[PDB]
Amino acid sequence: MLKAGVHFGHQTRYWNPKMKPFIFGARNKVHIINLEKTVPMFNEALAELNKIASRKGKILFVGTKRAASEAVKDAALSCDQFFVNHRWLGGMLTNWKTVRQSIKRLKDLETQSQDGTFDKLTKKEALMRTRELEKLENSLGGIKDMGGLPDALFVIDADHEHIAIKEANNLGIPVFAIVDTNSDPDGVDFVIPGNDDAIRAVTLYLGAVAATVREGRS
Amino acid sequence: SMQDPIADMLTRIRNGQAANKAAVTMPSSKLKVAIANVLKEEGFIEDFKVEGDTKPELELTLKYFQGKAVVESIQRVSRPGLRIYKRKDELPKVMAGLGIAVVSTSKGVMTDRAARQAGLGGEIICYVA
Amino acid sequence: SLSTEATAKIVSEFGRDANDTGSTEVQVALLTAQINHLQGHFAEHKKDHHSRRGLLRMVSQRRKLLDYLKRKDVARYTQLIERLGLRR
RNA sequence: AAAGUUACA
RNA sequence: GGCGUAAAGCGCACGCAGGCGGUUUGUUAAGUCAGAUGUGAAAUCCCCGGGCUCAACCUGGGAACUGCAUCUGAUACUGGCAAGCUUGAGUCUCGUAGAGGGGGGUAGAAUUCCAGGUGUAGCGGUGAAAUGCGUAGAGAUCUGGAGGAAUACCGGUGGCGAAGGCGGCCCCCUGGACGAAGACUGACGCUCAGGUGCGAAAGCGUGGGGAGCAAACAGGAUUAGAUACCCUGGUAGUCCACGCCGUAAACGAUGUCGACUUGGAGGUUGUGCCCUUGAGGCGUGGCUUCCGGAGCUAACGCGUUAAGUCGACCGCCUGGGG
Ligand SMILES: [Mg+2]
Ligand SMILES: [Mg+2]
Ligand SMILES: [Mg+2]
Ligand SMILES: [Mg+2]
Ligand SMILES: [Mg+2]
Ligand SMILES: [Mg+2]
Ligand SMILES: [Mg+2]
Ligand SMILES: [Mg+2]
Ligand SMILES: [Mg+2]
Ligand SMILES: [Mg+2]
Ligand SMILES: [Mg+2]
Ligand SMILES: [Mg+2]
Numbered sequence: 001m002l003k004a005g006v007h008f009g010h011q012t013r014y015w016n017p018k019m020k021p022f023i024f025g026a027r028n029k030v031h032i033i034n035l036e037k038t039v040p041m042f043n044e045a046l047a048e049l050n051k052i053a054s055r056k057g058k059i060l061f062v063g064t065k066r067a068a069s070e071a072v073k074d075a076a077l078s079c080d081q082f083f084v085n086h087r088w089l090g091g092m093l094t095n096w097k098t099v100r101q102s103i104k105r106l107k108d109l110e111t112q113s114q115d116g117t118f119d120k121l122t123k124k125e126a127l128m129r130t131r132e133l134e135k136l137e138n139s140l141g142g143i144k145d146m147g148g149l150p151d152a153l154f155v156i157d158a159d160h161e162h163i164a165i166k167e168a169n170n171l172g173i174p175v176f177a178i179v180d181t182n183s184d185p186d187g188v189d190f191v192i193p194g195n196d197d198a199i200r201a202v203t204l205y206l207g208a209v210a211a212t213v214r215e216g217r218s
Numbered sequence: 219s220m221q222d223p224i225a226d227m228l229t230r231i232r233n234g235q236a237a238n239k240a241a242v243t244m245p246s247s248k249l250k251v252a253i254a255n256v257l258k259e260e261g262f263i264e265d266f267k268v269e270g271d272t273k274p275e276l277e278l279t280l281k282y283f284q285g286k287a288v289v290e291s292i293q294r295v296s297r298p299g300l301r302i303y304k305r306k307d308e309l310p311k312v313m314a315g316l317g318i319a320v321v322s323t324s325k326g327v328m329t330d331r332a333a334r335q336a337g338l339g340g341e342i343i344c345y346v347a
Numbered sequence: 348s349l350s351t352e353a354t355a356k357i358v359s360e361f362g363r364d365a366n367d368t369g370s371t372e373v374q375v376a377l378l379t380a381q382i383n384h385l386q387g388h389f390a391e392h393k394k395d396h397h398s399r400r401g402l403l404r405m406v407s408q409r410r411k412l413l414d415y416l417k418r419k420d421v422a423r424y425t426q427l428i429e430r431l432g433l434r435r
Numbered sequence: 436a437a438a439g440u441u442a443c444a
Numbered sequence: 445g446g447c448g449u450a451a452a453g454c455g456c457a458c459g460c461a462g463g464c465g466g467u468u469u470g471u472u473a474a475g476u477c478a479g480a481u482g483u484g485a486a487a488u489c490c491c492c493g494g495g496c497u498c499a500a501c502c503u504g505g506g507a508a509c510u511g512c513a514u515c516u517g518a519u520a521c522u523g524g525c526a527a528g529c530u531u532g533a534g535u536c537u538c539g540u541a542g543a544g545g546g547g548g549g550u551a552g553a554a555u556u557c558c559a560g561g562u563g564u565a566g567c568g569g570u571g572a573a574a575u576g577c578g579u580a581g582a583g584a585u586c587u588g589g590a591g592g593a594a595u596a597c598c599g600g601u602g603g604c605g606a607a608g609g610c611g612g613c614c615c616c617c618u619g620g621a622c623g624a625a626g627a628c629u630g631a632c633g634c635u636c637a638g639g640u641g642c643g644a645a646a647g648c649g650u651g652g653g654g655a656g657c658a659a660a661c662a663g664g665a666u667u668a669g670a671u672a673c674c675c676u677g678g679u680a681g682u683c684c685a686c687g688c689c690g691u692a693a694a695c696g697a698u699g700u701c702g703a704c705u706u707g708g709a710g711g712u713u714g715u716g717c718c719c720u721u722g723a724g725g726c727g728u729g730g731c732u733u734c735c736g737g738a739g740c741u742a743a744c745g746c747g748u749u750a751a752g753u754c755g756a757c758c759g760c761c762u763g764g765g766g
Binding site: 368407416 | 457458459534535536537544545546547605606617618619620627628629630631632633641642643
């Protein structure tokens with residue numbers, strides 16, 4: 001209900017014209033996001049998020065820009081859910097029959113860090129295996145515990161995470177994305193018009209969303 | 219210059235639905251009011267209004283049942299370059315009767331189904347499918 | 348180019364009111380004044396083809412107004428072409 | 436600077 | 445069904461016949477529409493039946509004969525007529541920016557030539573050379589003069605013009621765009637076969653003029669040859685007056701005129717408002733450039749200046765070659 005007032009955004013002087021209903025202009029060559037038309041749909045997204053969290057749908061959080069790179073970890077690993085904080089691999093959803101192999105290798109390497117590849121072999125091979133494990137971990141991170149495809153996708157930038165959105169639309173996964181004035185509503189299933197390149201705002205979005213999910217676990 | 223104001227009317231509707239506009243507006247006319255009356259009662263477009271004293275201005279509230287537009291295809295038939303008049307025998311059917319044809323009879327502007335029941339013919343103004 | 352003083356004289360003459368500029372009598376008479384005036388210019392500058400194009404626009408658009416006024420009321424057209432002196 | 440050509444299944 | 449690139453938008457415009465035409469009221473019923481009557485030969489076709497044992501075939505009734513004429517009535521649309529209304533189109537007032545056009549002058553730079561003064565043995569040219577020019581004294585340099593042609597910088601996907609096209613400065617004749625606010629006319633409009641006009645360069649004719657370039661031509665090279673590219677020259681032409689020609693990859697390969705349909709960045713040229721404060725800002729118009737959304741499409745791409753959605757006319761295409 002327009003509480004924080006730190007999510008006005010505008011991303012730029014210019015815009016994407018499909019964002020017209022949610023904005024008005026400002027003196028700084030700036031597109032003020034209509035929060036009065038953001039809070040109603042935000043609750044709607046929270047309402048459906050509460051509904052799918054009751055069904056235990058393995059909600060996935062996606063954020064790669066440095067603002068939300070670490071916060072997505074804080075919100076996903078907070079309660080019960082998964083995340084993608086580094087680069088979204090092209091096709092980690094549509095081509096999940098292949099990405100599941102990399103998770104299997106990551107688990108095997110994670111096991112090998114406890115019984116195998118730590119001292120049973122040379123440093124010239126133990127180092128590169130360990131280097132590969134952390135390379136695999138940062139990319140295939142929170143989704144390592146996901147058993148398959150998710151049921152709902154949460155996105156911080158529609159424009160930045162366009163590939164992930166297109167993959168979810170290709171599948172049957174609702175996309176709960178927050179959109180700036182430069183983003184594209186065409187493709188997401190629950191728009192949340194607001195600022196996205198700011199810590200003060202994304203933490204508010206994630207904190208509200210995670211709290212809704214934790215209620216949904218009941 | 220403008221030589222078919224009705225074909226202009228259908229273009230505003232067609233482009234307004236393609237542009238997802240909440241309303242289209244054009245200079246008003248007796249014929250436009252008569253046709254827009256047909257389109258409103260038939261369901262294709264919502265309420266329409268005529269404002270003005272010396273320059274009447276006709277506004278149509280476009281209708282969208284879903285993300286799609288209610289008016290799928292709207293076409294001009296009897297144009298000034300080619301007038302199409304139909305007997306009561308051969309009044310056209312648009313989309314197997316799912317759509318309508320707006321026809322001008324001697325008893326006002328009606329649909330193909332209305333003119334058929336009235337047993338009249340006339341000018342085929344447009345197909346609204 | 349039909350100096351402002353010259354235009355006022357013709358507007359006041361053929362116009363049915365002191366400020367009636369726009370009636371087809373005035374429009375035709377203004378065109379006639381310039382068509383006649385431009386005639387001397389082109390007796391010297393034969394190869395001024397660009398100015399002659401503008402002259403032909405006035406010649407044709409006067410015929411449009413003359414042909415229009417005759418249709419509306421042939422009587423007022425007859426007193427116009429006689430007083431101006433044209434249509435031969 | 437000079438530098439042409441070379442039949443198909 | 446097509447016409448940017450596959451065949452296909454006249455080079456551009458004005459414009460008669462023709463085609464089409466804003467809005468309101470009335471009126472007439474011509475188109476149009478609803479019945480009715482007369483007729484639309486029979487046979488054929490079709491539908492329901494009947495007879496040859498079935499079939500073909502034959503045959504009873506219909507229905508058709510999509511047409512035309514006449515009578516009655518309906519007036520929504522189109523047409524005629526009458527009266528209007530301003531939106532389209534146009535007239536006037538004021539101003540603005542322009543290589544728009546025609547004519548007449550003139551300024552400076554440079555090339556060439558001519559006459560002179562210094563003055564020396566090379567200059568010029570090429571990939572290299574040579575022809576060529578030069579001890580009759582060139583080239584270089586200075587002075588004077590004559591002639592013609594073109595206007596560096598500005599200068600800019602800048603501007604103007606229907607197109608072709610238009611570039612120093614000044615004058616006098618002239619055309620067209622645009623804008624602000626006002627009046628005025630009241631459909632005066634759009635397109636246009638035939639017709640008429642304009643229409644790069646080259647070319648042609650008659651007079652001039654001729655600096656520089658330069659087809660042809662000549663000489664030198666290069667080459668296997670070299671009727672070429674390169675070099676040295678050089679005539680028509682290029683320049684002017686007046687006629688003719690009437691064609692260009694005359695091209696954004698995109699006819700003209702209207703309407704409607706997300707955006708971004710600029711250029712150019714008007715303008716009306718505040719805090720005229722000071723650089724500025726907010727808006728509104730006209731042309732113009734680039735990128736791009738939907739949509740379009742064979743794809744390239746086009747994309748508010750459409751190749752999108754549509755209307756009104758016109759032109760043109762129908763396999764390649766011949
Ligand atoms: Mg074809
Ligand atoms: Mg070709
Ligand atoms: Mg053309
Ligand atoms: Mg005509
Ligand atoms: Mg221009
Ligand atoms: Mg010439
Ligand atoms: Mg000659
Ligand atoms: Mg030569
Ligand atoms: Mg040609
Ligand atoms: Mg050209
Ligand atoms: Mg052509
Ligand atoms: Mg095409």
